[PDB]
């Protein structure tokens, strides 16, 4: 029973256009509730889920300060990083950061996050002990020295165990009728002849929340690990997710195959067959 | 808040 509060930011330098672009988003579990886009009339943190619009003007005015402060940081970071890696100011580059908190079934902080990536590659990240950093490269080991010197981690640990967990608790309460009520998948099997010797079985899982699901095929009680197709879990667009898995089978031997669905919205696991 |  895990819940999480996460922020993700993408900073992209645009040489030749002259100004960088910052896009920030925040999720509670698998539900996006805020966004910030610096390419707008005069950028503001806006709501993207109903359980957060009920918050007042001093929330929105505070989260906008927080975003713009973080954009100022990402703006310095992009130039500094060009320095560290010895690059021209002619290429376009990308900064990514992510921070937040997991709340366990213990009511306590399970895991905390503070990590960055430069040009798709890891740069620096908080260790799961929440005391030390993991720096991928020489350049990053700079930042590591600077951050161990001002002792930034204790400061950030205090945010995670404090204001972060409590916001997560407040959001979970405001949004309880969507965020704490799992939606079980609707499931069915479909049959599509490939030849007169083979056929396709496709197991569907539709309309579920949260996004974590296990969908597998078995032939006579054993799991198929080769010859199967799984599309990655995808959003419907309405707050729910879909997935399917498909297996190719000998004609007439379809009833030997079972699909197995595990999901937090199910009382217990589901086992289903193609129903003619 | 920390800068790289």
């Amino acid at each position, epitope marked *: 029973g895990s819940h999480s509060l996460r922020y993700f930011g993408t900073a992209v330098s645009r040489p030749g256009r002259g100004e960088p672009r910052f896009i920030y988003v925040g999720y509670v579990d698998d539900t996006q509730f805020v966004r910030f886009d610096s390419d707008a009339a005069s950028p503001r943190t806006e709501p993207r889920a109903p359980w957060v619009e009920q918050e007042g003007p*001093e929330y929105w005015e*505070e989260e906008t*300060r*927080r975003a713009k*402060a*973080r954009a*100022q*940081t990402d703006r*310095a970071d992009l130039r500094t990083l060009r320095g560290y890696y010895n690059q021209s100011e002619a290429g376009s580059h990308t900064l990514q950061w992510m921070a937040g908190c997991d709340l366990g079934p213990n009511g306590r902080l399970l895991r905390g996050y503070h990590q960055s990536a430069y040009d798709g590659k890891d740069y620096i990240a908080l260790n799961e002990d929440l005391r030390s950093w993991i720096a991928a490269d020489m350049a990053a080991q700079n930042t590591q020295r600077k951050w161990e010197a*001002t002792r930034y981690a204790e*400061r*950030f640990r*205090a*945010y995670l*165990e*404090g*204001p*972060c967990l*409590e*916001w997560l608790r*407040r959001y979970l309460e405001n949004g309880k009728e969507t965020l704490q009520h799992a939606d079980p998948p609707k499931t069915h099997v479909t049959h599509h002849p490939v030849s007169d010797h083979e056929a396709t079985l496709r197991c569907w899982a539709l309309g579920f929340y949260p996004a974590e699901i296990t969908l597998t095929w078995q032939r006579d009680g054993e799991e198929q690990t080769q010859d199967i197709e799984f599309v990655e879990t995808r959003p419907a667009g309405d707050g729910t997710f879909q997935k399917w898995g498909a297996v190719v089978v000998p004609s007439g031997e379809e009833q030997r195959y079972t699909c197995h669905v595990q999901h937090k919205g199910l009382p217990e696991p589901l086992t289903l067959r193609w129903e003619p | *808040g*920390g*800068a790289i």
Partner: T-cell receptor
Amino acid sequence: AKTTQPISMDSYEGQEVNITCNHNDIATSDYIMWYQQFPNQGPRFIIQGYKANIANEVASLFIPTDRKSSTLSLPRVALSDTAVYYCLVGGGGYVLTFGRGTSLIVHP
Amino acid sequence: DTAVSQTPKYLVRQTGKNESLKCEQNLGHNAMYWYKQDSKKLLKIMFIYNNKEPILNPYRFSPKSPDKAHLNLHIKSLELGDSAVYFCASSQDLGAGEVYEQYFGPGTRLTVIE
């Protein structure tokens, strides 16, 4: 974010001083901070925290789980501890609203 | 030694004249603050700067920030209400959730006279 505390306080040298602040409209993002000021000098940071208890080399602060009061403790006070003590709460962290504060006098 | 330094320490000037308060910190901090403290002893924020940018706020008072270590206050058309001790401060950073203690300069005590 609006704090209330005793106006004045007396103490004998060597005793432990406890100052109690009240913040009933404390929001979720707010930290609790205590600053010190001598006459004619810039205010000086003492201690800050979000919950429970925090403790450093100079003082300590206790926060009940309800978070709407806090208590600053000065362990063994010297005469160089005579000063005005401010209790601050929130502001996004960098906008500081100082109040009247508490005037602590330590006596020989 | 490392600290927020401020000059001058005392100042007496006539109304209508113009004046410059200068603040300097060699702590590596990026965020700087100006505070006004009137005779009824309450500290009111005036300006907040971060990495040479206005964050918070008359254009009698015109802060200047040539670089990140200096935030200077240039005042025009002095009036009687301008009499206070002006404290300059700085922080490692503006928070983005976590918070930073502020370090304060020694103040400039400014009296304006008719």
